[PDB]
Symmetry: D2
Amino acid sequence: GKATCLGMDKICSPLNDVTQRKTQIICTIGPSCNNVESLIGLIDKGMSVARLNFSHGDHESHFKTLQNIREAAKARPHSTVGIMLDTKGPEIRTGMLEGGKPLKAGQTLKITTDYSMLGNSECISCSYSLLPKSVQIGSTVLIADGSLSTQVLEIGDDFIVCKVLNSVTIGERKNMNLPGCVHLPIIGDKDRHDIVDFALKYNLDFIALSFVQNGADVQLCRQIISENTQYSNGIPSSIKIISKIENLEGVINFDSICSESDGIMVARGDLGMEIPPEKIFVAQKCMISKCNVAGKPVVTATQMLESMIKSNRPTRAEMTDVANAVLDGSDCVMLSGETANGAFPFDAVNVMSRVCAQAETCIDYPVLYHAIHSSVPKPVAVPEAIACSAVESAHDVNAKLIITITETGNTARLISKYRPSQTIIACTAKPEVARGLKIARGVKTYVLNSIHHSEVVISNALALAKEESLIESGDFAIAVHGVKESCPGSCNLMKIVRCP
Amino acid sequence: GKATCLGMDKICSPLNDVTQRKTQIICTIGPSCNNVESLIGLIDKGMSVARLNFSHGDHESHFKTLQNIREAAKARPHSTVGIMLDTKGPEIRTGMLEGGKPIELKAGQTLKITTDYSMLGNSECISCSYSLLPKSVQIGSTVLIADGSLSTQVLEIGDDFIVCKVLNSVTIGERKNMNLPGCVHLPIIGDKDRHDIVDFALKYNLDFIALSFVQNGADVQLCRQIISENTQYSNGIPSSIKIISKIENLEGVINFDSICSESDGIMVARGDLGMEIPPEKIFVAQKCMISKCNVAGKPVVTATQMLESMIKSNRPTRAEMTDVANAVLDGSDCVMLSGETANGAFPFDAVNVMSRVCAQAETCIDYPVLYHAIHSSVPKPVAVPEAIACSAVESAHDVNAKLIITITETGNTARLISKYRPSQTIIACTAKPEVARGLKIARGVKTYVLNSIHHSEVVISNALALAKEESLIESGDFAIAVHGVKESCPGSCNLMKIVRCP
Amino acid sequence: GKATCLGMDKICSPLNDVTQRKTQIICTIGPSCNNVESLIGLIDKGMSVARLNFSHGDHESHFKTLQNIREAAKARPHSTVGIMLDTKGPEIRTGMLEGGKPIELKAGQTLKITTDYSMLGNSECISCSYSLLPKSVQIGSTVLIADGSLSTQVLEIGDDFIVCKVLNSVTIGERKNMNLPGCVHLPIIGDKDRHDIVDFALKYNLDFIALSFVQNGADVQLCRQIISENTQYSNGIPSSIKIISKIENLEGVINFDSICSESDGIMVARGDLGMEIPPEKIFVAQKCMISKCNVAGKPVVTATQMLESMIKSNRPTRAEMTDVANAVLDGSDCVMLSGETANGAFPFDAVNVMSRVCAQAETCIDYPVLYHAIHSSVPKPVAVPEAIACSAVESAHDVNAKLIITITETGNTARLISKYRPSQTIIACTAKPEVARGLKIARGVKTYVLNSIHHSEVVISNALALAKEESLIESGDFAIAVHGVKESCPGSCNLMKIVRCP
Amino acid sequence: GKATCLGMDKICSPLNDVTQRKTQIICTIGPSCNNVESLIGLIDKGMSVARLNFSHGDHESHFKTLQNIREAAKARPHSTVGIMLDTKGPEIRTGMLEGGKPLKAGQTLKITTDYSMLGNSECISCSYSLLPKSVQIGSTVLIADGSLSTQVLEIGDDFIVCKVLNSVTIGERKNMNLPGCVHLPIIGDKDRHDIVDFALKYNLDFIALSFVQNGADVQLCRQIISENTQYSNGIPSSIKIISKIENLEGVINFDSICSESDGIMVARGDLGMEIPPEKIFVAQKCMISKCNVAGKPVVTATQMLESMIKSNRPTRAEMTDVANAVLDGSDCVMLSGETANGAFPFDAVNVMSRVCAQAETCIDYPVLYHAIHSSVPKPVAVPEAIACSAVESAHDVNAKLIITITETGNTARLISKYRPSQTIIACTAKPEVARGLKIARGVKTYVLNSIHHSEVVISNALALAKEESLIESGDFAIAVHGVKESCPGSCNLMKIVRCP
Ligand SMILES: Nc1ncnc2c1ncn2[C@@H]1O[C@H](COP(=O)(O)OP(=O)(O)O)[C@@H](O)[C@H]1O
Ligand SMILES: [Cl-]
Ligand SMILES: [Cl-]
Ligand SMILES: [Cl-]
Ligand SMILES: [Cl-]
Ligand SMILES: [K+]
Ligand SMILES: [K+]
Ligand SMILES: [K+]
Ligand SMILES: [K+]
Ligand SMILES: [Mg+2]
Ligand SMILES: [Mg+2]
Ligand SMILES: [Mg+2]
Ligand SMILES: [Mg+2]
């Protein structure tokens, strides 16, 4: 480690201190940060994308929250905020309890498939009616992100009984996992409805597709998008499909899924089920690596600052956990309970940002570039060659910025794949192109009315980047754009400019 | 990363973990595992080294525990257990609480801290071992307690006390450590520490001195002077006891290169590097120091308490396992259990978990990349043993050997092989038990203690037989054997055999 | 080697050499190719640079030849021809023979050598230009004649002569060069050489001074002082004429690093490094000096006469072609024809052969290995032009471009691109002819001279059109274009375009 | 180039001077060095292998020469000399002339298929009776190692007429080449006879198989060896087959030929025919590289010191030519006319040796080892792993020698493949194993009565190597051998010993 020890040589000196975070941040929006004032708070602390978990909320609160995010967005024109719909999918939920939270290690616990039943510390409810017919005796049934472990003793007609293996006092519409076993579709009636009549209807940027198990699941979601063009004038939506790997089937079929998807989302808590706890990091590190090579953005969806749901400070363990997620090659990190129903959403996003910024300094960039550069077969398409020259030139002359003028975001995604030390600024006229880039590592975006006068776009971008403390006068920047006529002809070029 | 994805390809198949842990494990010995039956329990779950924290216990319990470890050692002749004395040094401690029970401090509350150690403290007022506490703190100063779990800010400074605003909701017990601003106001090696080194570590022939709060090369040179001067208990030959320098402050990090060079090993804990290094920067220091050690060929211990939840629980968290795995991937030779073994409800389960996670994380190491990295760091020409060490590791990989055997009087070649970080378990065959124990912080070194090492053919036969009974190798598998010949080689020489297990 | 075996896979298929030579060619101008029609002949077969060896000719023939080269230049506007003055320097020459005819010396015979230059010599007695010849030789000393083709051993030393035992059966002509023991007894830059530089090279605005027998940096600094002091013929601006230091003795080899640094290029001949370096060691020196030049980014010329057989024959030998190929593979920017063009029977055929062999040897270069080698030799950060140069060469490879175009007022970026040794022909577009001519020793640089370079879009259009008519590129093929923008970039900048040939 | 410039740094210093040649040397035996005193002369100057070109000589002179080589061999017990039979094969020869040597550019030259005809400067003879029926008009016919070029004007019943393209005065049973066109077998009646009743009969070491065109040609030669066991007690001879690539067919089929053969022989003069002169080096460099990877010894058979047939000194061009042959990766070089019918055989071998020694110092060994090491797939057989450790250890501790005790020469051939800077000494009880190793780069051999006491073999080898100025007291040597019992078991090992 060379870059990591240059980091330690700075820790041992009096001096300024310069770090700008490139890892994108997803914030799960809920009661704790639902209003316009909180969402502006999250944007300032470094929210890249707003996540709506459609496992929670109702028709009314979903619409209200969308309006609040977009009102908060208008109050910060220099920050672009992506909006992600996270599908319910074939999840299984506990039913509601009598009053509040109930369970002691060694006890038996009954689970009924009558959801309309107020549960206690002996009998609880289950949303899955085929629960007895999809379980054997000795089967492990995990509850609440796999915090409560149980073993099935008895299987009835419309119930099961489970031996509790943990002392814990948590409940109320928490998730249930049935490892190795679930006769539910990946994209059900509700999910096809939520995609068409919310994600497509209100022109969202990301569908986080829950429990993806093979390429065909992603092809199905793409078919729904191409078939339902009613809310986009008859042009298929450019909304991005982020496949969530939540089970061993997904891991087995990763190569196919990763290829079909626009991105990948992995959580340690989900893979916990069928894959032994001491093996999960193997799967997570490999899938992230595979994504880095494929040039597909990967999100570490792991809840990594759990202590910050109740505390204003995290633990040292939690910071090391985030740092390793970044060093593993994560494009993007995610806050769940810390933002959605926690006491310190702003502090949680702030901590996540600072740790990410620090972990990014320990990346040996040369090693990483030459690794990815040698993975792509030659010859390549012009944009990918321009992308490489941008990243190479930037390093060679110690530029602080890479600016790309784009109608699609193609060149920005390609530059992001080569993982430069410099912040990427994607200058575009199309807001959905700007929002769509907000899971890509290191991509800030500037939304303009025109991109036709390249000299002016680069001038205005350098000026705005100056006011965002990304660059100073005399510093180098790489500018990248196409020319349509008299280049001669059409072309793509790369300028090494100086910030005035 | 290709080794990581070969790991994932196995997760998705019908087969049956075929993995042997190479990362060494230190177990802190205390009330929870003090007896002979518990210590045998720790050996079976994979204890490499027994740690005596001389911040705790008294003259009687220290000696009693030493006898118990060595009785447990006799009950497992095929496992070698190193014994480490961890010095008190210039630490600062909280006093006793009211007839026990851990107090629940609430964020926002005030906490008084007195210089009268003989005072039974409560959830408003606690004690401090350091009499110059008020004269070494300003108002607004952060004072960290219990491996920096409780953060507090000083409101008032009295004659012989301070008052502190608690910044955390947290539950802390008795005689926990305190950290104060600066870069240690006491001697590194005091009267007690020079006494503990000479009249315990040297007197009872221990294997490791874990030197607390090392701040520069001179601190290690001082400890070496004490060892060389005090030869009374070792017939007049300086003890070969190994000095493991603990980096517990920014001064130590600044002076690491010097410390690392002087020391036989290095010990780092995330919990100690609290203060002066911001929490979000510590991993930078820890990863760099571990890397530097890997290059230098000095064993490095991650002393971080990483399975804290297992002090009260039978199972760890998924976060804690990922934390251990990353410590191993970062390049740790050695991991450490503190509260999990010393005063916890599940010592055996804690060591078991640590072992299994370590074994899994080791499969994700890209070995070729790591070997060629370290091989190209050493300048040529080299000493014969280091050339033999490289050929052992190369040959082992080339023919897919399961074992590297070294017959040694010193442990020199074993330490060298360990530095090149082979996938194969190293077995150091020796007639000197202190050579065997001394190797137990070196990544991947198991040891076989014999009465003689004179007949090389027999030592290798017996080692392959023992390795067979330890499920390290099977019949028909290749092993690399490495030893010297004293006469008629011709002359003296060092050689490397590619043998087959019968 | 994989590029070499891709070459062999093409030798075994139905297709049709698609290859353009990048190695530059120097042609020595003399009686055999002195007229305007011959020089146009040399341009068409691939002459990069015209060499005037001022060891030969007189004031009149030098001026006449210069006019002929420049008239030939006007008759081929799309080809740029550099003009090189090769200094006499401290050389020693044989005198004239009896009304001509080359003498046949037989191994074992004696040969007398007199200090009376005005003496018509025979196959027993020849002349010498150096009056201190007897006073700078011992008995048994080896005296080499005609680029070290005739070896002789001194038997007797007289007042104003020596007698030598011939060691070779060989046929030598008039006014050939002599080499004597030591590490040059004359000035490097004499009265004649300072005169030839100022009142010919500078006076008539030549492009290269080939500085004979350079022995250290100070020799090159002296030549630079003469150029900077004598600005009379260039309006008071120091001439941008390029100094190519010739390493012709062991002193030069010893001091190479210094010489190479001071010089704009380097010239080495196997024939010169005769004596003090054993014949079987010369390739060691030549390969090393060429390598050093490749790293330093200074153009190096293999001045070795490699097609000697083609002075009398229409065809070369297979040995001579392998010799040229290896000169190119060794990393030569530039090759040279001497007798083959200057006084030979087949100048056009000689240049033609040199071109075809060079083109073939260039296909066997593993380019990736060569780029990453030179890229990792330069420390970061770098100047903008060198970063643009790298991106040009990388982009060119990545998208399989056939051309790299650079618009330049200096030739700076062209020289930098040339240093990274791309597979693509470089076209340096410039308004200054002396910038175009100055680039003609740089590997792979063709040049296009325009009246203006103000409209970048038009320069690139016209360059692609001209490159199309020179069979360098076809419609639909990619080209890299590289130039500065002076205003509204924003500001000034340097950029790289990936364009398509129409 | 690092090693090449360390060579130049030594050229510029006062100091000792230490080089030992590893490239093996083949000497073609003929009238100029036919007697016992000359052959001892060649051994001292550095002859590795004696070549009998069976295109020349008769039954009597072949046998006489074999006796002389073996008498010369007995007079130098510390030097092992391999003996190579070079087959006539499907070659074509000019007939004899009237008295002495005759031809002017532009003239016509008649060629008759009546071999029993004394030829002049208008009409010459040809050994190939099907010459008119295997040529078209405008076909190029090369004579005397392709020195005389001609174009065919007319084709008769039993003749052709050719336009001479060169002024040259050379003749008398010289070779003829017909590029692109020859209805002769690779192994004819004479060649099967020469192999069985000379090479096998008198227990020679190498068959240099002329004009090999594919794997099947080598398989045929191996069939002859396995079928004819009469002169070797019924055990197939371990004689080595060196396939000569003399035409484009051979180059096309190289991979197959190289795989089947024990070695490869390439001459620039032979490939000159069908492959344009300016392309030959491409073929030669590639085939040598391919051999280096495959671990098969390759001989540069090119006549490279032609000037030394008449002169006591070579040209600077000729030395550079030899040096490049070595740097290209040649295991072995060859003298033809320089030894066979030249004025200075001893000087020719001496020059070849000195140049080879110098060119070997310019080899960057690390680059070459890691190149070949990464070409072999793992896992490997024990001997190849021992071979690598030998070469690695040798470099790491700067050993001067690698000693291998062998019954087969297997480990010596493997060590030779990894191209160490150190001389390899193959200690063996079997002389034909010693002789068989003499084309392998850097292998000297010591023939003993026993190899059973390993300690004594290594002692005696270090002592002999001391007397051969290969090593001094205190210098390191690598020793490599098998142990049959009590290793424990059987094994192969590598010792780092010190020369006493
Ligand atoms: N849209 C929402 N409406 C109400 N509560 C929400 C919403 N989104 C999240 N939450 C709350 O915040 C928590 C954040 O966790 P998250 O990962 O989104 O859900 P889950 O508990 O299903 O894993 C949820 O558990 C829930 O208590
Ligand atoms: Cl943005
Ligand atoms: Cl052990
Ligand atoms: Cl040109
Ligand atoms: Cl030999
Ligand atoms: K969901
Ligand atoms: K302690
Ligand atoms: K000259
Ligand atoms: K033959
Ligand atoms: Mg969740
Ligand atoms: Mg502790
Ligand atoms: Mg000359
Ligand atoms: Mg021949």
